Write a protein that binds this ligand. Sequence first.
Ligand SMILES: [Mg+2]
Ligand SMILES: [Zn+2]
Lengths: 69, 122
Amino acid sequence: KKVYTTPKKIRHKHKKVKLAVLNYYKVDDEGKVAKLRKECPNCGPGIFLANHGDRFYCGKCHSTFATQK
Amino acid sequence: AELTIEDALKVVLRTSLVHDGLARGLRESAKALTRGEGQLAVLVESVTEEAISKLVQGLATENNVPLIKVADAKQLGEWAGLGKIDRDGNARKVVGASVVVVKNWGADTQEREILLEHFSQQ
Ligand SMILES: [Mg+2]
Ligand SMILES: [Zn+2]
């Protein structure tokens, strides 16, 4: 057979940078809750917006926002 | 001793697990609480920093209160079945169940309902 080419640069699947008990949401009083950012208009509450410099999206609908918030 | 020692929550949890209607974990629980899904709420007592528990409480408050004490979480998890096979009997690797919320229920009536009622009406 013919020899393999060998440029060098390999690309692996990203490990994702997992993070839980994320700093979204808050509570001040104790009794009631204070939501941070916002929930989805398309789907029901529980899902939360992605916040960037005048650009939003959500993951349950893979990524489908446009309007600011 | 024929009377149940808070063993009409564990049973419910088991049932939920069997029929696949358990929001285990915190985010999931929160989600359940938010929409027409989360019917019974199950928060850990021994929480470091008190924060998760507080959150759970808040969630419960927000619209309809479905909360209960919970006996250390680990026990609950064990009851549910957190572990594959685990030899012939028992011998499951211990896991903290964390926050749990019930969807679906499945099974009807029995002592669980009574317990819920008791918790509610004051
Ligand atoms: Mg080739
Ligand atoms: Zn969405």
